[PDB]
Amino acid sequence: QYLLPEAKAQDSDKICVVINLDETLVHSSFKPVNNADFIIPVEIDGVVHQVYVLKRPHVDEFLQRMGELFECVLFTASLAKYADPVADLLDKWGAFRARLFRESCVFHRGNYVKDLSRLGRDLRRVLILDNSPASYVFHPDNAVPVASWFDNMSDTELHDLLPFFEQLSRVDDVYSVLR
């Protein structure tokens, strides 16, 4: 069956956006860093390692606003033991109606792919925001590219995208704009 249950009713009329975690909303690593926004303990073979996470600039405004405009869904190739705690700490407003991790992606030709057909939404009303064009090779027409992010504290790409999404949120068919 599909990955998502039916949209709950205030969301039925909304475009579903699939949003990626790593290098899109945050950048994490095992290398300590003093200014991590989050530190997450992750157990790998019985040893607890520390993951240090930085928030992309304007991520908070981004999610708050996207959370009103869309049925927002987290889709990541990372494992839940990492992504779930990050999503918990990052998503103060409940933008994310659902979360999907590595086991929900399709492993194909090397890559973990976000197969949008598997969501169970109408694809004319689906978008994927993802920094890696490999993630949506099955549906590149549903995509809003976004540059990879690592630590540039001058980044404004999440602020700067909101106007595009505001107008996207209104249309009947996303292909009408991304062709």
């Binding site: 945050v26 994490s28 992750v42 790998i44 993951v51 190739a77 990372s78 494992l79 033991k81 990492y82």
Partner: peptide, 4 residues
């Protein structure tokens, strides 16, 4: 990795 557990990350992406």
């Amino acid at each position: 990795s557990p990350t992406x």
